[PDB]
Amino acid sequence: ITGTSTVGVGRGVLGDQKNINTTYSTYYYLQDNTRGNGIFTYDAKYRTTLPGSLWADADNQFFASYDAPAVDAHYYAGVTYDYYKNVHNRLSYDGNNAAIRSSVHYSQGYNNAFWNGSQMVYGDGDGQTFIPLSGGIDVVAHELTHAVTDYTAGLIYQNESGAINEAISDIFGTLVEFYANKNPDWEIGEDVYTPGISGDSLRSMSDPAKYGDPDHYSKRYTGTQDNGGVHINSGIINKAAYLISQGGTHYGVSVVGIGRDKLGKIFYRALTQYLTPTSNFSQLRAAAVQSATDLYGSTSQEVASVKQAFDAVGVK
Numbered sequence: 001i002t003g004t005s006t007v008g009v010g011r012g013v014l015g016d017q018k019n020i021n022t023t024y025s026t027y028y029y030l031q032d033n034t035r036g037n038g039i040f041t042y043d044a045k046y047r048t049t050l051p052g053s054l055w056a057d058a059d060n061q062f063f064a065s066y067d068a069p070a071v072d073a074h075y076y077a078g079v080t081y082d083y084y085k086n087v088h089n090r091l092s093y094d095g096n097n098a099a100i101r102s103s104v105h106y107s108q109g110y111n112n113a114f115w116n117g118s119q120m121v122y123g124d125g126d127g128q129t130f131i132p133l134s135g136g137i138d139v140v141a142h143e144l145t146h147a148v149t150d151y152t153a154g155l156i157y158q159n160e161s162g163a164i165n166e167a168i169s170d171i172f173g174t175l176v177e178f179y180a181n182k183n184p185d186w187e188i189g190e191d192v193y194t195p196g197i198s199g200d201s202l203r204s205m206s207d208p209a210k211y212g213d214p215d216h217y218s219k220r221y222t223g224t225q226d227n228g229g230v231h232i233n234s235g236i237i238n239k240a241a242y243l244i245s246q247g248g249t250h251y252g253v254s255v256v257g258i259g260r261d262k263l264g265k266i267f268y269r270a271l272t273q274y275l276t277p278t279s280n281f282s283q284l285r286a287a288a289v290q291s292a293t294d295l296y297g298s299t300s301q302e303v304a305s306v307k308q309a310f311d312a313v314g315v316k
């Protein structure tokens with residue numbers, strides 16, 4: 001919409017107050033003009049036609065319970081934008097500041113979120129398994145990251161390349177959570193998953209087995225569910241990623257941690273310069289080794305740790 005940039009205030013899904021960038025033109029719209037070619041948040045109004053209506057508000061105050069999911073979708077999209085620009089020098093998901101669009105209140109009781117090829121989509125959850133999913137910064141960065149992947153490596157969404165696609169979104173969803181540095185962890189979706197149960201999450205990168213996901217290649221799922229287990233087999237790469245950053249001894253294999261920042265640089269480089277739509281785990285190991293080599297030299301600790309990590313999850 002054409003208008004003048006403003007700043008609204010409201011409350012997100014977890015009750016936190018935050019400033020949001022809006023645009024004023026009779027109404028205040030959830031349109032942030034301060035980043036790239038804008039960040040736009042839409043109301044799907046509990047239906048499934050997308051994107052729905054650009055979020056319109058009469059007074060630039062977003063404290064209603066109905067406003068909360070939009071507030072967090074809009075704000076965490078901005079945090080994710082900032083991560084890619086400030087940390088990887090990437091402008092929006094396409095690298096050329098494409099407009100970023102999100103819809104909230106999608107469908108009824110919808111226990112998921114996704115990238116539909118053109119925009120992010122967030123259900124409200126059924127209130128038991130989930131609360132509105134945009135309340136999770138890792139979830140928002142996971143989704144936006146699916147866009148980054150689609151514009152870059154293009155990892156096909158099935159079997160091993162699909163588990164890599166998924167791990168990539170969990171890794172950067174996690175790196176963004178640490179970047180915002182509000183209660184960060186190596187867990188996925190803990191802020192919005194099962195309001196009645198403390199301490200659980202969708203997935204764990206540090207111990208995928210905790211929620212039934214493999215942490216070794218010999219435990220990979222090869223059935224047909226979940227597109228060949230893309231949300232299951234991602235645990236093998238997630239673990240490898242957690243190990244590279246934090247170190248550890250896994251099935252007797254010891255890994256010297258190198259830190260999140262180097263983990264993000266190596267995986268960012270693998271994602272945009274070496275992965276292809278059909279890469280498999282073994283090809284991801286080589287991409288990561290070549291990326292660490294590029295950034296830190298073939299004799300660095302970094303390359304050595306990347307090797308240790310893939311050994312540890314049984315990926316050759």
Ligand SMILES: CC(C)C[C@H](NC(=O)[C@@H](NP(=O)(O)CNC(=O)OCc1ccccc1)C(C)C)C(=O)O
Nearest residue numbers: 111112113114115116117139142143146189202231
């Ligand atoms: C929601 C969770 C219980 C499990 C899981 N979803 C997730 O882990 C994450 N959602 P996601 O983005 O991976 C769902 N992706 C997804 O459904 O992709 C299918 C698709 C949709 C539109 C166009 C092309 C392809 C998010 C919730 C962190 C799943 O879809 O299995």
Ligand SMILES: [Ca+2]
Nearest residue numbers: 057059061062
């Ligand atoms: Ca209002």
Ligand SMILES: [Ca+2]
Nearest residue numbers: 183184185190
């Ligand atoms: Ca957290």
Ligand SMILES: [Ca+2]
Nearest residue numbers: 138187188189
């Ligand atoms: Ca998390």
Ligand SMILES: [Ca+2]
Nearest residue numbers: 193194195197
């Ligand atoms: Ca919970």
Ligand SMILES: [Zn+2]
Nearest residue numbers: 142146166169
């Ligand atoms: Zn995903």
